[PDB]
Symmetry: C2
Subunit: 374 residues, 2 copies
């Protein structure tokens, strides 16, 4: 029949092994690498790392090296294991449930690295802290070694280096999408100024290396260099509040295909969420108030946000303490705070731009008016 005994409890990393679809993208191990990139970028965003180096080995493994603080090797006071063993083997264990150890961290669930380990036949990592370099190895998510000291290092030579071999049984294909991972990694250098990011595909000999201090405008200009945007130089804005920061570059294109990237604590949000909603409302408000204060609007036509957005190319990078994502892969942002904050920020900053740059704003407005009439 049906009793309490028929209720089974998955513990440790087993929930990830039995249903990985809810913890990662099972199409490719790219998002597993992303999880490791993110923890390195989070160290970078906290002013502790200045270099992320990603290597795609010919044996299918991927490795991420940062010069951040290194994940703790110390013994957990109420968990009996060294921190790294705890981090790699337990769900909902992480340093980012507060805003003490990381301010604007991409990681929030304490699940990321553990998913990598749970879905990797092998994980080998080297941590450098307190003058000593350590090594720990895992197999099929289980601890495969002890906390080894492999060498001595300079006191301030710190960092985490993690290399994982994705188990092909959990994925439609074990092959990495290099173009996507290349694009992803460069944007991390654009969005975290001062961070040097390198990628090395040992299968093709590719090397790439990025460093940008103030490059959001030039980043989006470069991604649509073939197309004619207006303003030709890409309206950019910003707003800081030490709990929320927003940066964006936006343009309107009469012809061609649209770059539309959005980010939350440097994590890409493919289905965009609420922060993109605020940018649309704010830009729309500033544009329907510019069409009316100047009577650019034929009569009978009213601008819907859809008309504003149909031909926009934007790059939105929001940073906030405690975002709210809909899943571990973090594809849309559902924080309701974000919609208003960006709408206001963009509404003020675009209104000033238009009343300062009247002829350009008209040419913007005509693109929206042409979409609404249609």
């Amino acid at each position: 029949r049906y009793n309490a005994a028929d209720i089974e409890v998955l513990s440790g990393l087993d929930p990830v092994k039995r249903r990985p679809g809810m913890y990662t993208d099972t199409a490719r191990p790219n998002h597993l690498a992303q999880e490791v990139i993110d923890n390195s970028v989070d160290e970078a965003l906290a002013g502790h790392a200045k270099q992320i180096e990603v290597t795609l080995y010919k044996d299918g493994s991927c490795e991420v090296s940062d010069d951040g603080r290194g994940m703790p090797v110390d013994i957990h006071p109420e968990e009996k294991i060294p921190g790294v063993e705890l981090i790699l083997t337990r769900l909902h264990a992480g340093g980012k449930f507060n805003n003490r150890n990381y301010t604007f961290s991409g990681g929030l669930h304490g699940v990321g690295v553990s998913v990598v380990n749970a879905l990797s036949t092998k994980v080998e990592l080297f941590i450098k802290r307190e003058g000593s370099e350590h090594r720990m190895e895992f197999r099929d998510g289980n601890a495969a070694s002890k906390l080894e000291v492999v060498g001595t290092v300079g006191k301030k030579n710190t960092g985490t280096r993690l290399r994982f071999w994705a188990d092909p049984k959990y994925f439609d294909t074990p092959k990495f999408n290099v173009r996507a991972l290349r694009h992803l990694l460069r944007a991390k250098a654009v969005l975290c100024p001062g961070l040097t990011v390198k990628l090395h595909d040992e299968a093709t000999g590719e090397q790439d290396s990025w460093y940008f201090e103030n490059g959001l405008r030039d980043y989006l200009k470069g991604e649509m260099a073939e197309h004619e945007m207006l303003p030709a130089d890409l309206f950019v804005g910003s707003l800081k509040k030490d709990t929320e920061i927003v940066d964006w570059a936006a343009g309107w294109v009469p012809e061609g295909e649209l770059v539309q990237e959005s980010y939350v604590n440097l994590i890409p949000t493919a289905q965009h969420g609420t922060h993109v909603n605020g940018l649309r409302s704010g830009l729309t408000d500033a544009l329907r108030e510019f069409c009316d204060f100047r009577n650019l609007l034929p009569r009978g036509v009213k601008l819907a946000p859809e008309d504003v957005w149909d031909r926009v190319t934007f790059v939105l990078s929001l940073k906030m303490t405690d975002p709210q994502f809909s899943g571990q892969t973090k594809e849309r942002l559902s924080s309701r705070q974000a919609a208003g904050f960006i709408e206001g920020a963009a509404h003020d900053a675009f209104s000033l731009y238009l009343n300062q740059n009247v002829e350009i704003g008209e040419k913007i407005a005509q693109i929206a008016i042409d979409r609404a009439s249609a």
Copy 2:
């Protein structure tokens, strides 16, 4: 600094309370009710329940009652607490990790009910099993009462009744979307024939009761009675293989707005996924093997899936052992197996309909090819 002590381990329901966005749609508590609905529908899908009754009380709470097997009240052999206590209190604990207690269940993660309670100021449930009626109450996710024997019942009166009071701090709005929950509940009666589904919103004066012995074709006809489809009588198909079942009704609409509903073990998948991709592939493949065999397709123009799919209206219901969803909200199905299974079923079944009903099959092709003209 930053040592192992700074790594926090959230246990119990604490992960849900600190980051509810990854476990539910925090825009409104609708998805909390869905989790309770889903567990009742799974009892129905296992041939043990024949009526689910949903009541949206004016005090903001929701209650879902089924006449199924009732969730276990005995003590778990290795967890020491009664089954209901384990179900409500622990993550990744369920009877749906195998195909023993439920064959085609919507639930797969063992997390659903725990999320509802974890995000509710109060939860009160009644179970009917073993001739005795039990009751247990929760507050803020914690057990607030014991497993009380509140009454006696007949041997064959069995069932589960759960009432939860969603904590308003976790949600953008505490009011339920009745239109959405109304539409949802009707699909459960349509997709599980013989199941009687009742909705009672005590605030809207609304009462509803759904029962269909065969309603898939009639369901889509009613939702697109406002537009003229082709075939006017709605091409439908089906296929069973003792591991997966697929049912669908599909039509092509020259004018009006397209209803496109997809389901996996009766759980709605709004961002459809692989089951819809296979249906699109099968129907498109079958239509060119018809446009080319009957030479209705101009050459130099080719039929792509987008052209077939541009104006399709479908309702697709897949049932399979071990689906794979991308998140707790189960918005996309990523099982790549399902894509092929439906493609074959749809490809064979659509080829037959066209070759028998060609004057209709032609007018279908005209919609697809004209759409390709652009």
